[PDB]
Design a protein around this ligand. Sequence first.
Ligand SMILES: [Cl-]
Lengths: 70, 73, 71, 68
Amino acid sequence: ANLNQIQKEVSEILSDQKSMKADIKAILELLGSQNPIKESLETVAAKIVNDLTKLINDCPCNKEILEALG
Amino acid sequence: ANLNQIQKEVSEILSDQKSMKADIKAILELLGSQNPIKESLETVAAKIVNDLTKLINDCPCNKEILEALGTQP
Amino acid sequence: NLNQIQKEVSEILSDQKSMKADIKAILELLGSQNPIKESLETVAAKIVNDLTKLINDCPCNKEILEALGTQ
Amino acid sequence: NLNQIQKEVSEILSDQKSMKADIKAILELLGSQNPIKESLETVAAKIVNDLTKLINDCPCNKEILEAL
Ligand SMILES: [Cl-]
């Protein structure tokens, strides 16, 4: 009765992993499918500053003052 | 040395692995909950640029200058 | 034959041990940081507030008022 | 029964060695990276500093002073 209990639990351990392996794979396929943070942050920061480096050179506030200056 | 000890050992492995399976599941259900960084950035970066666009297009500094020019803003 | 089974089984255990410690480390790392949406909001707010303060503080106006004839 | 068990045990041990190495690597990866809140502070300060460069420069004064 001893050996069978060991046989049962051993079979269960070995089975148990295969769904554990499926999960570890999913975590590695998930980590290696996203972009790095520093590359992502540069690209969006560079977009914020570009969009604003343009509107500030746009000089929206020049009009009304040039209206009064004629 | 003996089958009795092996049995405790085997049971202990089994138990701990069960715990580990659940703990691994959690890691996955928590890297999975974390939604795209590349999508979260774009939405916030739009909100930053929108706000500061509203401010600039308000021309806060014209009031002082139009005052000197004798014209209402 | 129970010697070899005992040696393997101890080595399975000893490894689960180190495995355990790593999952713990992974769960601590992930579990201990602000949601991505939360951390991006405080930074964004930081930026706007840092830039509003400068803009509202009207830096370029004195050069104009000087040229206009004021001071 | 016994040789059966000795084989599943070898199989558990070997299959686990690969799991433990992948787990170590998951950790390796979440280490290679510096905290998200830590990298956002740095990229934020350059965003403001360089628009600070732009605004303090007064790109909109040239057109006003030309009328004065
Ligand atoms: Cl992450």
